[PDB]
Every structure is written in structure tokens, then in C-alpha cells.
């Protein structure tokens, strides 16, 4: 918080400000990994997920909670990008892809539960229709997660 | 053959036989058969050539009561890049399994181009397993072969509609194929890798794929291997 | 010993060529497809091979790379371009990726700016080893730079329309008055590669 | 006409037609799935556009999305036509080209084997 406030602060000297931003970046470098948010970032970038309690643990979710939305919820947009790409295209659920879309469903569910303002984007991202379209799936677990996210969207309307 | 036989039945020692350019020996045997002025068969080849090969490849095997074993691995170049040649057809049903060569991979500037698809061995079941090589041998072998095949199919598919239509298992098989081609397949001229190093490299290359990405692997093996 | 078989129709099933194949240490094939296409002298990509390539590389260890090890790279590019064109012929230019288009352009370039040789022309009559190695180095440079730029977030169209001189210069890189103007041409080529950005 | 080279070219063309048939089949499947999803989306867009039909400003942000959905619909129709052409090509690569190539290869093989048999008979004589 001190580094955040310092970053939000102002400085007359150039070296002071440069060292401030550098120290903030240096702190944020190892701050993201504790509780590593980069672990989920690797799964997101590679578009391949696995079994980890990243979205299961409230603490781990709370650690990356502040990093969920930076500019127009870019991280959230990239998070929904995989599911959307698995919606408009692909959408053949077997083995990996199904559990990945389900884990992404639960993660986005916890995310929406944490961030109330994350709904307005989901409507403009076409995720509102895709989430409802996921009500009927091949797996009962996938349908359960989709129904959970449906009730989550029904929580705040 | 007699030299290998003398070091087996008598000297009682492990022996290995290697023959190069069996096609040249086939043309030589053709000239030898023509020396008797006998009427040649199809495509100018002796009809007894099957027995001639049967008098060659039958010099390999294990003897009961003898510790020393003799193994033979002949080599023949297919004429005009065709497997339809009489020689290949002769050694095909006789010998168990065959090791082919891909001209594309050889023209790709890589290490030895043995196509995993065509490569097979009938006695391969007895050459692996616990006490022989490893329990992770056959399973990872079939899994790697499946990865290369499905990777090839996905390579053909991606060359059609593009890489935007790439699916999960499709992209995984693509990366696995590219990796195996640029890592697993490529060894070297003087390079010799141990079976343990081969299995380790296989598991490391298969680590790119998820745990559910391999349907050819058993639960116990996967639990006793992956770490 | 330089021997040339005369197979009828350009078939590799010729008994003369069949017998000469299991003897000669080097075989240069002539593709009937490229020959009837009024293209400069035909050489099959996958069929052409040399058993002395290892020894020739050992002798090239003194003369160094470019293009001792880059011949295998160009072979990889040409083979991959062949496997890509094999599908493309049954597919077309409609659905393809960026790397695929770059590979196709690399194929057309390797065909036109390298394999093509005019014996009738005084300038194209012959090319030096260092000259051909320089052309291959330039082609591999443009190719690697294209692959790098494709990973930099740049499209194919803008990159293709960016430099139109570099291509025409890459096609003209076959001497044409060797060997004195070699190093300077290499410097200009590197200057263009640095001018690409 | 009956040459080994011709047999090789015919066989190569046959294999290429087979691989092309498989590729066209998979492409037809993907196009079918895509056209199906686009069809469901077309129905959803039909109900959405039918929701409000028959005031103030900002109507420019309304009919635009409907125009996009209409573009998706037309693209879906074109995808259906293309899928039909692909299915026709697959049908032409099934009982037409494959059978013709197989029959031609069989006849050529018979002719070559018979010619070789005649030559071998003359040599034996």
C-alpha cells in the first residue's frame, strides 16, 4: 500500500520518481508470487488449465483480486477470452477442454462474486449468452458449474 | 554367418550381425543365378531367392541350453524409392517388423529419419518391461507414436483451415509433434543415448501435454513415473 | 567420374538408372515436371542427395559455415515448403496462416532467386561458391527476419509492402560480375536487413 | 498407355485425392458445426430483433448490432452453401474419383502383368 501510494504520489526530482517506479515494479515482481498469480497466468496464456486450488482458496483469489482489473478489466477480458474462443469456435467438450472450461467457469464465478462491476463487461463480451447456453452440457459437473455461475449472475441483476 | 555361428554354438558368446546393401547382394545373386543360364523370374530375379533369404535370416536366434545368443539386423536399399521391390516383399513376411526411412525428414536437415508410423517390431513386446528395460517403455512408446500420428493429422488439418481452428488436443499434438521431431527424433551421428535417458527425454517431452492428454497410459505407471 | 543416364520419359524405374543408383556415390535427378515448365535446369528436392555430404562438411570445416550448415536449413525450408505446397495444391490460397504464406514466399524466392540459372546469359553463366552461399545467407536472413517479425505482431501484407527493393535485390544477388564485388554486396544486403526494422 | 510411371502418377493422384477427401471431410464437419452454432445464433438474433420492432435518440447503437447479426446470418447461409459444395466434393471423391482410379490401376496392373508374362514366356521360349 505504501508503494501504491508512492506511485500515486508526485516527485520533483527525476531520479526519485524513476527509483520510485523501479522499486514499485521490483516489489510487484515478487508480490505477484506468494501465492503465485503467474501460475494461473501460465495456464491462461497457454490456454491450458489444470487442477489447482487457485480459484478454490479464498486467500489466493484475494491475492490476485486487485490484479483482476487494471485497464477496462484486461485480465478479466483475457480470462473470458478463452471461454469465448471455446464458445464461438471449437466447443467440442472432451477430457481436457471440458474441465478447463469448467475451471474457468468456477474461476470467473468467484471473480464475479468478488467484483460486482465485472457484470457490465460480460454482457458486452457476449458472455451473458454463452453462460446461459452452457446450462445444458455433456457433463453434469459442467452443467453444475454453469448453473452455479447462472445463480451467481442471478445474485446481482 | 558361419563366423557368427562359430561364436555362438561353440564359443558360447553374444554376437551381432549387420549386413549392408542387401540389394547389391541381390544383384550379385542375380548374376550368380544367371551364371547357370537359368531363365529369370519376375523383373529379372530368381524364384529361389525366397529360399536364399530363408538360408540367411534363419541364422539368427536363441539356442536352448546355450547362454550365447546371435542376433542379425540386415539392411537393404529400396530401388527407385519403392517398397514394391521384390527384396522388401521377401524380407517383409520373413523378418519380424521393418525399419523404414522418410526421405522428407532426411531432406529436412535432421538426424536419422526413421518414420515412427512404419517402424514396428513383433518381438518388441519381449524386449521391454520390468527386468528388461522399463515398465514405462511400451506405454510411452505407443503414446509417443499416437502423438506423432495425431500430430501429423493435426498438421494436415492446420494446413487446411489454418491455425485458428486448432483444438485443445489438436494444438497439444501439434506442439508434441514439433517437439518430438526437433528433439526426440533428432539424436546424432555419433550420439548414443541410454534407454533411461530415452525414457527420461520421452517423459520430459510428454510433460508439455496435460495429465489427461494421454489415454494410452496406465494410472499406476503415471503415478509411479511423473514427478 | 561424371555419368549421365538417359531414362525414357524421366522415369526413375529405368533399369540403367536402377543399376547406376546402387553404384554411384552421387546422383543428380532431373524432374520432368520442372523441365516441361520451361524452368531452369530441374533438380528434385527430396530425391537429390549426397553421401559425401559429411566428408564435404568436414572439408567445409576449414571454409566455415554459410552455407555449410545453412544448406541443411535451406533443405528444411524447401522440404517444409514442399509438404506445404502439396496440401496447398489441394487447398488453395484461401485459408492459410502467416507462417504458411511466409513459407510459400520463401519457396517462390528459393526457386526464382537461387535454383534459377541461365547458361545463355553472360552474367548468369556461372556463380561462385561464396556467391551462392551469400545469396543463401541473404535468403535465410530475410526468412528468419520474417519469422521474427511475425512473432513481433506484424502482419504479412504490411511487411510485404514495406520493402519491395529488397526482394528484387535478392533475386539479382547471383553474380553477375564476381568475385570482387562480393563483400560490398554483402554489406549492402546487411544494410538492407538493418533497414527493414 | 500402360506404363509403370503412369501407374505411379495415378497412385499418387489417388492417395492425394484420399488425403484431400479426409481434409474436405473434416472441413465439412467443422463447417457444419460452425453453421449450426451460427444457426442457433441466427434464431437467437431473430428472437432478439423480434423482441422490439413495432421515442428518443441512441437508436444508432441498436440497429447496428442487428446489422452485425444479419451479417453473421448471411455468412451462415454462405457457410451452408459452401458446406454443400464441400459435401458434394466429398461425394465426388468417394464413389467417383476413387473408383475410377482403382479400376484404372487394376486394369493397368493387369496389362503390365500380362505383358511381363508374355515377355517372360518369350524369354523362356
Swiss-Prot record, chain A:
An MF annotation (GO) of this entry: proton-transporting ATPase activity, rotational mechanism
Main location class: membrane
Keyword Ribonucleoprotein: no
Subcellular location: Vacuole membrane
Disruption phenotype: Increases the ATPase activity of membrane-detached V-ATPase V1. Abolishes growth at pH 7.5 and in the presence of calcium chloride, abrogates growth at pH 5.0.
Gene Ontology biological-process annotations: endosomal lumen acidification; Golgi lumen acidification; proton transmembrane transport; vacuolar acidification
One GO CC term, this protein: Golgi membrane
Statement: the UniProt record of this protein carries the keyword Membrane: yes
Top-rank taxon: Eukaryota
Keywords: Hydrogen ion transport, Ion transport, Membrane, Transport, Vacuole
Primary role: Subunit of the V1 complex of vacuolar(H+)-ATPase (V-ATPase), a multisubunit enzyme composed of a peripheral complex (V1) that hydrolyzes ATP and a membrane integral complex (V0) that translocates protons. V-ATPase is responsible for acidifying and maintaining the pH of intracellular compartments. This subunit is essential for activity, but not assembly, of the enzyme complex. This subunit is also required for silencing the ATPase activity of V-ATPase when V1 is detached from V0.
Miscellaneous notes: Present with 22500 molecules/cell in log phase SD medium.
Subunit structure: V-ATPase is a heteromultimeric enzyme composed of a peripheral catalytic V1 complex (components A to H) attached to an integral membrane V0 proton pore complex (components: a, c, c', c'', d, e, f and VOA1). Interacts with YND1.
Protein name: V-type proton ATPase subunit H
The encoding gene: VMA13
From Swiss-Prot, chain B:
Protein's cellular compartments: Vacuole membrane
Domain of life: Eukaryota
Residues annotated for ATP binding in this entry: 122
Described function: Non-catalytic subunit of the V1 complex of vacuolar(H+)-ATPase (V-ATPase), a multisubunit enzyme composed of a peripheral complex (V1) that hydrolyzes ATP and a membrane integral complex (V0) that translocates protons. V-ATPase is responsible for acidifying and maintaining the pH of intracellular compartments.
Any further remark recorded for this protein: Present with 131000 molecules/cell in log phase SD medium.
Subunit details: V-ATPase is a heteromultimeric enzyme composed of a peripheral catalytic V1 complex (components A to H) attached to an integral membrane V0 proton pore complex (components: a, c, c', c'', d, e, f and VOA1). Interacts with RAV1 and RAV2 components of the RAVE complex, which are essential for the stability and assembly of V-ATPase.
Family the entry assigns: Belongs to the ATPase alpha/beta chains family.
Protein name stated in the entry: V-type proton ATPase subunit B
Source organism: Saccharomyces cerevisiae (strain ATCC 204508 / S288c)
Classification lineage: Eukaryota, Fungi, Dikarya, Ascomycota, Saccharomycotina
Gene that encodes it: VMA2
Residues of the full protein shown: 260 to 486 of 517
From Swiss-Prot, chain C:
Superkingdom of this protein's organism: Eukaryota
Intrachain S-S bonds: none
Stretches assigned to coiled coil: none
Residue list for modification Phosphoserine: 62
The protein's name in its UniProt record: V-type proton ATPase catalytic subunit A, 2nd part
Record organism: Saccharomyces cerevisiae (strain ATCC 204508 / S288c)
Lineage of the organism: Eukaryota, Fungi, Dikarya, Ascomycota, Saccharomycotina
From Swiss-Prot, chain D:
Organism name: Saccharomyces cerevisiae (strain ATCC 204508 / S288c) (Baker's yeast)
Upper classification of the organism: Eukaryota, Fungi, Dikarya, Ascomycota, Saccharomycotina
Note: Present with 8500 molecules/cell in log phase SD medium.
Job of this protein: Subunit of the V1 complex of vacuolar(H+)-ATPase (V-ATPase), a multisubunit enzyme composed of a peripheral complex (V1) that hydrolyzes ATP and a membrane integral complex (V0) that translocates protons. V-ATPase is responsible for acidifying and maintaining the pH of intracellular compartments.
The name this protein goes by in its record: V-type proton ATPase subunit D
Family: Belongs to the V-ATPase D subunit family.
Subunit field text: V-ATPase is a heteromultimeric enzyme composed of a peripheral catalytic V1 complex (components A to H) attached to an integral membrane V0 proton pore complex (components: a, c, c', c'', d, e, f and VOA1). Interacts with RAV1 and RAV2 components of the RAVE complex, which are essential for the stability and assembly of V-ATPase.
Localisation: Vacuole membrane
Domain of life: Eukaryota
Section covered of the full-length record: 9 to 205 of 256
Amino acid at each position: 500500500p505504501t508503494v501504491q501510494s508512492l506511485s500515486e504520489r508526485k516527485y520533483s526530482d527525476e531520479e526519485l520518481r524513476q527509483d520510485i517506479s523501479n522499486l514499485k515494479e521490483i516489489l510487484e515482481n515478487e508480490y505477484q508470487e506468494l501465492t503465485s498469480f503467474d501460475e494461473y497466468v501460465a495456464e491462461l496464456d497457454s490456454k491450458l488449465l489444470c487442477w489447482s486450488p487457485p480459484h478454490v482458496d479464498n486467500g489466493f483469489w484475494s491475492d490476485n483480486i486487485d490484479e483482476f482489473k487494471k485497464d477496462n478489466y484486461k485480465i478479466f477480458r483475457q480470462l473470458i477470452e478463452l471461454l469465448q474462443a471455446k464458445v464461438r469456435n471449437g466447443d467440442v467438450n472432451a477430457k481436457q477442454e471440458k474441465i478447463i472450461i469448467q475451471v474457468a467457469l468456477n474461476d470467473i464465478t468467484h471473480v464475479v462474486e468478488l467484483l460486482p462491476e465485472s457484470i457490465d463487461v460480460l454482457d458486452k463480451t457476449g458472455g451473458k449468452a454463452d453462460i446461459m447456453e452452457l446450462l445444458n452440457h455433456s457433463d453434469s459437473r459442467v452443467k453444475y458449474e454453469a448453473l452455479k455461475a447462472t445463480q451467481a449472475i442471478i445474485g446481482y441483476t | 554367418l558361419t563366423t557368427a555361428e562359430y561364436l555362438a554354438y561353440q564359443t558360447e558368446r553374444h554376437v551381432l550381425t549387420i549386413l549392408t546393401d542387401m540389394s547389391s547382394y541381390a544383384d550379385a545373386l542375380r548374376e550368380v543365378s544367371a551364371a547357370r543360364e537359368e531363365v529369370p523370374g519376375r523383373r529379372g530375379y530368381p524364384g529361389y531367392m525366397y529360399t536364399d533369404l530363408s538360408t540367411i535370416y534363419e541364422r539368427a536366434g536363441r539356442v536352448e541350453g546355450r547362454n550365447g545368443s546371435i542376433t542379425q539386423i540386415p539392411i537393404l536399399t529400396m530401388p527407385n524409392d519403392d517398397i514394391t521391390h521384390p527384396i522388401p516383399d521377401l524380407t517383409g513376411y520373413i523378418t519380424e517388423g521393418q525399419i523404414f526411412v522418410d526421405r522428407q525428414l532426411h531432406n529436412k536437415g535432421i538426424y536419422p529419419p526413421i518414420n515412427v508410423l512404419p517402424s514396428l517390431s513383433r518381438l518388441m513386446k519381449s524386449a521391454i518391461g520390468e527386468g528388461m528395460t522399463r515398465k514405462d517403455h511400451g506405454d510411452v512408446s505407443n503414446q509417443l507414436y499416437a502423438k506423432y500420428a495425431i500430430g501429423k493429422d493435426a498438421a494436415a488439418m492446420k494446413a487446411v483451415v489454418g491455425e485458428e481452428a486448432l483444438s485443445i488436443e489438436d494444438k497439444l499434438s501439434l506442439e508434441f509433434l514439433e517437439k518430438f521431431e526437433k528433439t526426440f527424433i533428432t539424436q546424432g551421428a555419433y550420439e548414443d543415448r541410454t534407454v533411461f535417458e530415452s525414457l527420461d527425454q520421452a517423459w520430459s517431452l510428454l510433460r508439455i501435454y496435460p495429465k489427461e492428454m494421454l489415454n494410452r497410459i496406465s494410472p499406476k505407471i503415471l503415478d509411479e513415473f511423473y514427478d | 567420374i561424371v555419368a549421365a543416364v538417359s531414362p525414357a520419359g524421366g522415369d526413375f524405374s529405368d533399369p540403367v538408372t536402377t543399376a547406376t543408383l546402387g553404384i554411384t556415390q552421387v546422383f543428380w535427378g532431373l524432374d520432368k515436371k520442372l523441365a516441361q515448365r520451361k524452368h531452369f535446369p530441374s533438380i528434385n528436392t527430396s530425391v537429390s542427395y549426397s553421401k559425401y555430404t559429411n566428408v564435404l562438411n568436414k572439408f567445409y570445416d576449414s571454409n566455415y559455415p554459410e552455407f555449410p550448415v545453412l544448406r541443411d536449413r535451406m533443405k528444411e525450408i524447401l522440404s517444409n515448403a514442399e509438404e506445404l505446397e502439396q496440401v496447398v495444391q489441394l487447398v488453395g490460397k484461401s485459408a492459410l496462416s502467416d507462417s504458411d504464406k511466409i513459407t510459400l514466399d520463401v519457396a517462390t524466392l528459393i526457386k526464382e532467386d537461387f535454383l534459377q540459372q541461365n547458361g545463355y546469359s553472360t552474367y548468369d553463366a556461372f556463380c561462385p561458391i561464396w556467391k551462392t552461399f551469400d545469396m543463401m545467407r541473404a535468403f535465410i536472413s530475410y526468412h528468419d527476419e520474417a519469422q521474427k517479425a511475425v512473432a513481433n505482431g506484424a502482419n504479412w501484407s504490411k511487411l510485404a509492402d514495406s520493402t519491395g527493393d529488397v526482394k528484387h535485390a535478392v533475386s539479382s544477388s547471383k553474380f553477375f560480375e564476381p568475385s570482387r564485388g562480393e563483400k560490398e554486396v554483402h554489406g549492402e544486403f546487411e544494410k538492407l536487413l538493418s533497414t527493414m526494422q | 498407355f500402360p506404363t509403370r510411371m503412369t501407374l505411379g502418377l495415378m497412385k499418387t493422384k489417388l492417395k492425394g485425392a484420399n488425403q484431400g477427401y479426409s481434409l474436405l471431410k473434416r472441413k465439412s464437419e467443422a463447417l457444419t458445426k460452425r453453421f449450426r452454432d451460427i444457426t442457433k445464433r441466427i434464431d437467437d438474433a431473430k428472437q432478439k430483433m423480434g423482441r422490439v420492432m413495432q421515442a428518443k435518440e441512441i437508436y444508432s447503437r441498436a440497429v447496428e448490432t442487428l446489422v452485425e447479426l444479419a451479417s453473421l446470418q448471411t455468412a451462415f447461409i454462405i457457410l451452408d452453401e459452401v458446406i454443400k459444395v464441400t459435401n458434394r466434393r466429398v461425394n465426388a471423391i468417394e464413389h467417383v474419383i476413387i473408383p475410377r482410379t482403382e479400376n484404372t490401376i487394376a486394369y493397368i496392373n493387369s496389362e503390365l502383368d500380362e505383358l511381363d508374362r508374355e515377355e517372360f514366356y518369350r524369354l523362356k521360349k
